[PDB]
């Protein structure tokens, strides 16, 4: 569901994508635990205030370059389950029919 | 009297005596003319100077103070007569001339 | 033992690129493997001949230089 | 033992044409290989010429003919000029 | 709406051509080539020792010959109004070169 | 001696190509053939004359042609050896 290195799903508009958790945020201690480990916010690592006080997660999206890693809070990231794959197919088909209606 | 090099007498830098000895020991002919090693050393020195000049020009164009095999390859392939002379000669680590066919260019 | 498969397709692609090749068919790689093998036999046979005539057991670079020279492919930078 | 080469003479020629340009070891190795190649080519052609005319001596004329046969155009002309000048200077000296 | 960036077919190829027509280092892995050379050097003689310089000279000559053959193949394919080389181009190139 | 390269008539080049296994021939080939042949002849004759002059002779022998062809990597048999 939500563990360091575990598979996680993340929303993005009308779509969602599978990502890998690398840092799990603890707002109370103002530190994130990372795997190559309680460490505070880094010299370049920074989380926006609206999600730094919630359970945030620094993730890398599978199939996408490492330049697009995102600090996603608990709002979008869900527990990796088969039903999440069902919703993935659901909005994938939604985008498919949206594009088809755009064309045809 | 004091020994004077035959290269100095001919005003050359290439060792005429070594050239003459190698000609004698090279099994090319029974006898060797006296003016032969001078001529050969002069021709070798001229060709060396030509290609060294071209290689130094190439090295300077690369803002480098030392000539590398890449400079030698570029100088040889860029000079038409020199390239024809070394037509079947392969230079180690010389690379190739940067050349791309027109039709492969994006249009 | 299939060291001919040690010549992977990335290396063939790199050589083609240095050769100025843009698009490569999939059947090319094995053809290059065969041609390179033929070239290697042609050179190595003469190299071993030179090594044996010198009554030696270790092949020297000068042997390869002579073999290349007698095949019309002069090489510099090695002696 | 000791092996002879053309390193010093090529170095002097380089310092004459480019009195400030250095050189690497691989470059002068290629230089020596090229020098030996040219030497063997010219000497073999000269020996072939001498045997062609049934003569036991290799003179500067044979080298001139060999250079004319082996070098293309302007290189041949310039090398002929250099050889002639060097021969005349050495004989006069 | 998120799309991943990717160049069109034929761009990375030209970039690689420019990159490798500039550099001069060897392109083939050393150990596989050495193993292939040693394996080939068995149907003429057994227990053959090798100076490293011989192996590297072999690699240099082989790579140069392969590059020249590649360039000839490229010319042959272009003459056929194509941008892709197929082995018949190599065969024609080696045939005209006299290797065949 | 001017305008002799036109002496190689189109039927001659046609016969040469037919021996070469050529079935259909473009019309703008013959001048290219003449130019290439001229280049080859010049290259051979230069060395042949060089050999003749080195011997201080005034006539060019076939044997000189043999040496010139040999030096250019084109060996010819049956002309003196």
> Domains of chain C: which residue ranges?
1-78
Q: Which chains touch D (3 or more CB pairs under 8 A)?
A: B, C, F
**Contact between D69 and F50 using a beta-carbon 8 Å cutoff:** yes
Identify the architecture of domain F1-79 in CATH.
Orthogonal Bundle (1.10)
Contacts of E4 in chain A (CB under 8 A): 63-65
Contact in structure between A22 and A58 (CB atoms under 8 Å): yes
Strand partners, A25: A32
Asked if E4 is an interface residue toward chain A (Cβ–Cβ < 8 A), one would say yes
Chains A and D touch each other (3 or more Cβ pairs < 8 A): no
- Rounded CA gap, B98 and D52, in Å? 44
Q: Under an 8 A CB cutoff, do D49 and F47 touch?
A: no
| Neighboring chains of E (3 or more beta-carbon pairs < 8 A) | A, B, C
**Resolution for this PDB entry, in angstroms:** 4.0
Pairing of strands B66-67, D22-23: parallel
Asked if B50 and D75 touch (Cβ cutoff 8 Å), the reply is yes
> Are C74 and B90 a contacting pair, CB within 8 Å?
yes
Domain limits at E76? 4-100
Structure tokens at C20: 């100025």
Contact B89 C18 (CB under 8 A): no
Superfamily (CATH) of domain C1-78: Histone, subunit A (1.10.20.10)
Q: Which residues of D31-58 are buried (b: 16+ CB within 10 A; e: fewer)?
A: bbbbbeebbeebbebbbbbbeeeeeeeb
Q: For chain C, what's the residue count?
A: 79
Chains A and F touch (3+ CB pairs under 8 A): no
Structural domain boundaries of chain B?
1-107
Which homologous superfamily is B1-107 in? Histone, subunit A (1.10.20.10)
- How far is the C-alpha of A63 from the C-alpha of F77, rounded, in Å? 69
Residue C69: both structure tokens together: 């020279």
* Structure token pair of residue B95: 């690379």
Question: How many domains, in total, are found in chain E?
Answer: 1
Do the Cβ atoms of E2 and A65 come within 8 Å? no
Q: Residue C72 region, left (φ>0) first, then alpha (ψ -120 to 50), else beta?
A: left
Q: Within an 8 Å CB–CB cutoff, is residue B88 touching chain C?
A: yes
Nearest to E64 by CA among B67, B79, B89: B89
Looking up tokens 């050999």 gives: F51
CA distances for D81 relative to B42, B47, C11, F55, angstroms: 10, 12, 49, 21
User: How far is A62 from A14, CA to CA, in rounded Å?
Assistant: 18
For residue B7, how far is the Cα from the chain centroid? 18
Nearest chain D alpha carbon to C65 = D33
DSSP one-letter code for E8: P
Let me know if B52 is exposed, middle or buried by CB neighbors in 10 A (0-12, 13-18, 19+).
Answer: buried
- On the CB side of F75, CA atoms within 13 Å amount to 2
Residue ranges making up the domain that contains D86: 1-93
């Amino acid at each position: 569901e939500f563990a360091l290195g575990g598979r996680c799903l993340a929303f993005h508009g009308p779509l969602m994508y599978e990502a890998k958790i690398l840092k799990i945020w603890d707002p109370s201690s103002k530190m994130y635990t990372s795997i190559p480990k309680p460490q505070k916010l880094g010299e370049d690592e920074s989380i926006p205030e609206e999600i730094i006080n919630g359970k945030c997660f620094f993730i890398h999206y599978q199939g996408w370059k490492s330049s697009w890693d995102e600090w996603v809070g608990y709002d979008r990231i869900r527990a990796y389950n088969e039903e999440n794959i069902a919703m993935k197919k659901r909005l994938a088909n939604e985008a498919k029919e949206a594009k088809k209606s755009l064309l045809e | 009297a004091k020994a004077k090099t035959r290269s100095s007498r001919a005003g050359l830098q290439f060792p005429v005596g070594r050239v003459h000895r190698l000609l004698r020991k090279g099994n090319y002919a029974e006898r060797v003319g006296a003016g032969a090693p001078v001529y050969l050393a002069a021709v070798l020195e001229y060709l060396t100077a030509e290609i060294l000049e071209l290689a130094g020009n190439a090295a300077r164009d690369n803002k480098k103070t030392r000539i590398i095999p890449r400079h030698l390859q570029l100088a040889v392939r860029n000079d038409e007569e020199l390239n024809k002379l070394l037509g079947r000669v392969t230079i180690a680590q010389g690379g190739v001339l940067p050349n791309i066919q027109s039709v492969l260019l994006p249009k | 033992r299939d060291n001919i498969q040690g010549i992977t397709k990335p290396a063939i692609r790199r050589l083609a690129r240095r050769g100025g090749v843009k698009r490569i068919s999939g059947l090319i790689y094995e053809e290059t493997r065969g041609v390179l093998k033929v070239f290697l036999e042609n050179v190595i046979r003469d190299a071993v001949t030179y090594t044996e005539h010198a009554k030696r057991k270790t092949v020297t670079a000068m042997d390869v230089v002579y073999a290349l020279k007698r095949q019309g492919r002069t090489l510099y930078g090695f002696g | 033992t000791r092996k002879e080469s053309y390193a010093i003479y090529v170095y002097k020629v380089l310092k004459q044409v480019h009195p400030d340009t250095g050189i690497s070891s691989k470059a002068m190795s290629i230089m020596n290989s090229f020098v030996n190649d040219v030497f063997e080519r010219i000497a073999g052609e000269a020996s072939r010429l001498a045997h062609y005319n049934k003569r036991s001596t290799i003179t500067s004329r044979e080298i001139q003919t060999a250079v004319r046969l082996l070098l293309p155009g302007e290189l041949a002309k310039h090398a002929v000029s250099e050889g002639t000048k060097a021969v005349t200077k050495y004989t006069s000296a | 709406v998120k799309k991943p960036h990717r160049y069109r077919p034929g761009t990375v190829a030209l970039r690689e051509i420019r990159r490798y027509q500039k550099s001069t280092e060897l392109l083939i892995r050393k150990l596989p080539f050495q193993r292939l050379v040693r394996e080939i050097a068995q149907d003429f003689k057994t227990d053959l020792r090798f100076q490293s310089s011989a192996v590297m000279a072999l690699q240099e000559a082989s790579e140069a010959y392969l590059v020249a053959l590649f360039e000839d193949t490229n010319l042959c394919a272009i003459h056929a109004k194509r941008v892709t080389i197929m082995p018949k181009d190599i065969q024609l190139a080696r045939r005209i070169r006299g290797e065949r």
